[PDB]
Amino acid sequence: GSMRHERVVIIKNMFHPMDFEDDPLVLNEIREDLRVECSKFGQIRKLLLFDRHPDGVASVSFRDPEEADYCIQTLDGRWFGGRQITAQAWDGTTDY
Ligand SMILES: [Cl-]
Ligand SMILES: [Cl-]
Ligand SMILES: [Cl-]
Ligand SMILES: [Cl-]
Ligand SMILES: [Mg+2]
């Protein structure tokens, strides 16, 4: 087994907060789309979007550390909604 953070992926550049200015529903569109996409890598335990964060941060927690690893390897550098995203392992201590 593993400490919790080994199951957690930090995804950046999913959005910019300006995206939700005119239409709050856009935030939920990106949440849903990220749920659908991250379901490819493993069983999602938690998914959060830090909707005010300039860097477009989301956290995704999986059931198993191997799922997080597969997500990081596959999503990093992909394009979503015109944005080139990154995916990194969480460190267990950085808050967004
Ligand atoms: Cl931007
Ligand atoms: Cl795919
Ligand atoms: Cl969620
Ligand atoms: Cl959220
Ligand atoms: Mg890992």
Percent strand equals 25-35%
Examine the secondary-structure arrangement and name the CATH architecture.
2-Layer Sandwich
User: Could you tell me the radius of gyration in angstroms?
Assistant: 13 Å
Question: Order of strands side by side in the largest beta sheet?
Answer: 2-3-1-6
Q: How many domains comprise the coordinates? A: 1
Please count the helical segments.
Answer: 2
Q: What's the main sheet like?
A: 4 strands, antiparallel
Using DSSP, what is the number of strands?
6
Which H/E pattern describes the elements? Answer: EHEEHEEE
The CATH topology label is Alpha-Beta Plaits
Q: Judging from the principal axes of the Cα atoms, what is the shape?
A: globular
The ligands found in this model are:
chloride ion, magnesium ion
CATH superfamily: RRM (RNA recognition motif) domain
Helix content: 25-40%
What would CATH call the class?
Answer: Alpha Beta
Region (U2AF homology motif (UHM)): 3-96
Subcellular location: Nucleus; Chromosome
Modified residues (N6-acetyllysine): 40
Domain RRM: 7-92
Notes on the protein architecture:
The chain is α+β, with helices and mostly antiparallel strands and 96 residues long. The protein has one domain (6-91): Alpha-Beta Plaits (2-Layer Sandwich), CATH 3.30.70. The chain is 26% helix and 25% strand. It has two helices and six strands, in the order βαββαβββ. The protein has helices spanning 25-38, 65-75, and strands at residues 8-12, 44-49, 58-62, 79-80, 83-84, 86-89. The strands form two sheets. Strands 2-3-1-6 form a four-stranded antiparallel sheet, covered by helices on one side. Strands 4-5 form a two-stranded antiparallel ribbon. It is globular and about 45 Å long. The protein starts with 7 loop residues before the first strand and ends in a 7-residue tail after the last strand. The structure holds chloride ion (4 copies) and magnesium ion. Residues 31, 48-49 line the site of one chloride ion (CL). This is 17S U2 SnRNP complex component HTATSF1. It is found in: Nucleus; Chromosome. Residues 3-96 are annotated as: U2AF homology motif (UHM). It comes from Homo sapiens (Human). Belongs to the HTATSF1 family.
